């Protein structure tokens, strides 16, 4: 409709829109706080890296503010702006506090969008991949839960000049795509949203915060670590039912199962991150090694007394260790799983 004029006024408005405008200055620099409304759409979450204490998230990041100096007049109530204008219009310098490294996608023209409206409101959207720091406690390694945060805010403009608010409410703004749960180690419980002020040598600032809650999937470690260790302990304990006079046989059970435990302790370290305290899994492996070690020491004492004191009652030791070892290992398991499951 009104084709020839419709194109003419579009370029006529957009070309003259930038006269009398200084992009080095805020809207209402000396009069008002510049309120910025934000939103996020998470295209993908993860992968999460325990060794590097980081995670990767893909987001369409939306920002909206009203600039009185860009109030155009025309038939169209909304007006897309070309990127040539986007680089010559003031935009917030929002940055992410947690960002290790980030990509503002740049493929086939930049992934940026800037719209303008009759009342001067600007809508600025742009696609990001954020690699964010997630400090995580690890005392419960295989059974732990985490909340990796995402924090962002203005860099230069302090709390008295720019403030950030969630556009459609705190928890009603952020959205995660249905396909976006791109995790293999973890299962995403959900997310929560909030905001807070902070203070620095350069002044106060307002932060926007969003936590993504995670719970680790235990299934892998049961078949990888716990079972081979549990079975290996059952092997070391069956040696008590063998005859005491088969010294070469009794010996190789004790030593070989120790060697089997040694191999099973190699993989645990590789699956773990490099943290410097004993995790719940390290308790298990250390105790399993104790049972396997003490089983062969049990034979050593039985061997000594039956050889140095032969009609001796040394057979008592086998009959006691046959019940003691399985039971005491059982109570350790009940204590171990009760301690960390009901947690």
């Amino acid at each position: 409709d009104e084709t020839n004029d419709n194109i003419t006024i579009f370029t006529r408005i957009l070309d003259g829109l930038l006269d009398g405008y200084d992009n080095r200055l805020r809207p209402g620099l000396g009069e008002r706080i510049t309120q910025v409304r934000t939103d996020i759409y998470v295209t993908s979450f993860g992968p999460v890296s325990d060794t590097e204490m980081e995670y990767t998230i893909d987001v369409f990041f939306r920002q909206s503010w009203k600039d009185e100096r860009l109030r155009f007049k025309g038939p169209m109530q909304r007006l897309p702006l070309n990127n040539l204008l986007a680089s010559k219009i003031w935009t917030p310098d929002t940055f992410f506090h947690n960002g290790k490294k980030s990509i503002a996608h740049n493929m086939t023209t930049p992934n940026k969008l800037l719209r303008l409206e009759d009342d001067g409101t600007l809508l600025y959207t742009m696609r990001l991949t954020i690699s964010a720091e997630c400090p995580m406690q690890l005392e419960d390694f295989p059974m732990d839960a985490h909340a990796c945060p995402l924090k962002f805010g203005s860099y230069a403009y302090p709390n008295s000049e720019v403030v950030y608010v969630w556009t459609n409410g705190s928890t009603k703004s952020v959205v995660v795509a249905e396909d976006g749960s791109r995790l293999n180690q973890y299962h995403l419980m959900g997310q929560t949203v909030g905001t807070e002020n902070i203070s620095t040598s350069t002044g106060e600032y307002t932060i926007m915060t969003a936590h993504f809650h995670l719970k680790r999937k235990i299934g892998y470690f049961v078949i990888q670590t716990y079972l081979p260790c549990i079975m290996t302990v059952i092997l070391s304990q069956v040696s008590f039912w063998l005859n005491r006079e088969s010294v070469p046989a009794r010996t190789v059970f004790g030593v070989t199962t120790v060697l089997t435990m040694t191999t099973l302790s190699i993989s645990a370290r590789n699956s773990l991150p490099k943290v410097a305290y004993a995790t719940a899994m390290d308790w298990f492996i250390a105790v399993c090694y104790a049972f396997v070690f003490s089983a062969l020491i049990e034979f050593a004492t039985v061997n000594y007394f039956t050889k140095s004191q032969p009609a001796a009652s040394i057979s008592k030791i086998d009959k006691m260790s046959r019940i003691v070892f399985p039971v005491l290992f059982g109570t350790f398991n009940l204590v171990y799983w009760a301690t960390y499951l009901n947690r």
Partner: protein
């Protein structure tokens, strides 16, 4: 007259008065962008990262009446540095993780104009795209990795996409081989997707990848099968030879542990249960049970005609029960993961 001036002034005339800030046929119907791809290669597929990498010649084709020129019969091929002085669709790949246009010698782009204002715009792109991979059936699995093409700023009211050439708009997929996979089929789809800010046009390209299992048969299944069979040798050694029945047993457990430990260190780290893991743990139980079998025999032999009768009877049963149960286990495993 003369090409050197006639063509030079023509191109200057086209750009003089142009406005890249405004889309073709503005105000009118959406500009219809046709697309086609020539896939040079699929570089890699990463389950640990859950992504795959393409290299392709990505071409776009649309009409801009502002670029009509007369007299010249040639389809003018311009220098790739002119592509920054014209309007081009703001197309982007939705599931892209990291991509770049090749730039060695000179930026790998092309623009060909034609007398009637239709523009052909080509790029050579290397892109790493996310792919959802379900490894629960690994290594006996197949995967459906896709490439998503979408317009960023314009709704379907301003931009329209279509596969130029229909179902044969993507080529080169039939010329590609991978070490681990083989492409069963590829499919082309076009859709209009509605979400928070408007109805968007999208084109989708999908590949079905079937893994090659010969590598794993030789490295994982047969080793476990043979080590498991060496465990049954214990039942044929005389029970009086305790030092032999034992060293065969515990060493087999250590042999099986070494295989299980290092396989999962070499093959990609995917921390959740997989089909190969169910097999390896299934074998660990058979090696586990084949040694508890002796411990039961040794106690019966020494501690409790029963001494020679039961001890030899348990071996006689174990010689058939263990092989039969392992045959049943394999039959259930294969007909589960392969035929069900």
């Amino acid at each position: 007259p003369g090409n050197m001036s006639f063509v030079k002034e023509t191109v200057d005339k086209l750009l003089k008065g142009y406005d890249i800030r405004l889309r073709p046929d503005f105000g009118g119907p959406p500009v219809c962008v046709g697309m086609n791809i020539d896939i040079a290669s699929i570089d890699m597929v990463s389950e640990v990262n859950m992504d795959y990498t393409l290299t392709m010649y990505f071409q776009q084709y649309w009409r801009d009446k502002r670029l009509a020129y007369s007299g010249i019969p040639l389809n003018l091929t311009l220098d790739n540095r002119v592509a920054d002085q014209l309007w081009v669709p703001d197309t982007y790949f939705l599931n892209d993780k990291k991509s770049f246009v090749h730039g060695v010698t000179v930026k790998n782009r092309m623009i060909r104009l034609h007398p009637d204002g239709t523009v052909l715009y080509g790029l050579r792109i290397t892109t790493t795209a996310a792919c959802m991979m379900d490894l629960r059936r690994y290594p006996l699995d197949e995967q459906n990795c896709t490439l998503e093409i979408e317009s960023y700023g314009y709704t379907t009211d301003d931009i329209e996409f279509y596969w130029r050439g229909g179902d044969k708009a993507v080529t080169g997929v039939e010329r590609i081989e991978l070490p681990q996979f083989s492409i069963v089929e590829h499919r082309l789809v076009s859709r209009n997707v509605v979400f928070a800010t408007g109805a968007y046009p999208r084109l989708s390209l999908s590949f079905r990848l079937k893994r090659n299992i010969g590598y794993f048969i030789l490295q994982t299944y047969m080793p476990s099968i043979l080590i498991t069979i060496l465990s049954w040798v214990s039942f044929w050694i005389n029970y009086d030879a305790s030092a032999a029945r034992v060293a065969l047993g515990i060493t087999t457990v250590l042999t099986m542990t070494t295989i299980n430990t290092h396989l999962r260190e070499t093959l990609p780290k995917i921390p959740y249960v997989k089909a190969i893991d169910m097999y390896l743990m299934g074998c660990f139980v058979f090696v586990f049970l084949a040694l508890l079998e002796y411990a039961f025999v040794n106690y019966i032999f020494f501690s409790q005609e029963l001494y020679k009768g039961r001890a030899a009877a348990i071996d006689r049963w174990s010689r058939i029960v263990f092989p039969f149960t392992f045959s049943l286990f394999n039959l259930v495993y294969w007909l589960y993961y392969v035929n069900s």
